């Protein structure tokens, strides 16, 4: 419980989640379904730029009670955080400036880390494109269960959300599911067909 073995080797983090696992064959093997309730909580700080000004304006207009919305707004100059539950959000959207930070909800296409508690090989943790769904559990294509060793027997499944573009791209390129089909032990493909697919 000391510093060295307790907090230096490993430590707890925020912006994470844990939910029951459940299958979904109608998703691509690089995609994972995220419950809306978790999506409304997990937020990704997006920098307001010239490309996505209208997108962030619409998301701010949605508010925190609607899924494609934001939870906080951070100004470029002053570091005051504006909580979008109160105040006319339309004036706030019209007040947006380039370089501002908007903590939008987890939306489609956000790279999200996806991991299982018993970790044995490097494929125990991967990165997936997140698609939001109205149900309550994490869903993905079952052809990916073999690296995770999960079996939909009530297992819990850890979810991590990066907060940096560099980290996001690193996750997408390196631990992207499409980029880790073969295990590094002997180059044998781990992601493949499974029961009720082979049959």
């Amino acid at each position: 419980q000391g510093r060295f073995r307790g907090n230096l080797s490993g430590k707890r983090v925020d912006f994470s989640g844990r939910t029951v696992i459940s299958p979904d064959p109608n998703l691509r093997i690089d995609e994972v379904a995220v419950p809306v309730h978790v999506a409304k909580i997990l937020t990704f700080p997006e920098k307001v730029n010239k490309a996505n000004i209208n997108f962030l304006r619409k998301l701010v207009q949605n508010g925190p009670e609607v899924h494609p919305g934001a939870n906080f707004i951070q100004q470029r100059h002053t570091q005051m955080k504006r909580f979008l539950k109160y105040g006319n959000r339309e004036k706030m959207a019209q007040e947006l400036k380039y370089g501002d930070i908007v903590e939008r909800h987890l939306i489609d296409g956000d790279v999200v880390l996806f991991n299982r508690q018993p970790s044995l090989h490097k494929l125990s943790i991967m990165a997936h494109l997140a698609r939001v769904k109205p149900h309550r559990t994490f869903r993905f294509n079952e052809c990916v269960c073999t690296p995770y060793n999960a079996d939909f027997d009530g297992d819990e499944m850890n979810l991590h959300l990066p907060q940096t573009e560099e980290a996001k791209a690193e996750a997408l390129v390196l631990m992207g599911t499409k980029a880790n089909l073969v295990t590094p032990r002997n180059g044998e493909p781990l992601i493949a067909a499974i029961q009720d697919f082979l049959t």
Binding site: S9, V13, S124, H160
Partner: peptide, 9 residues
Amino acid sequence: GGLRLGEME
């Protein structure tokens, strides 16, 4: 509390 990045992760 949030999740824990164990050493294996």
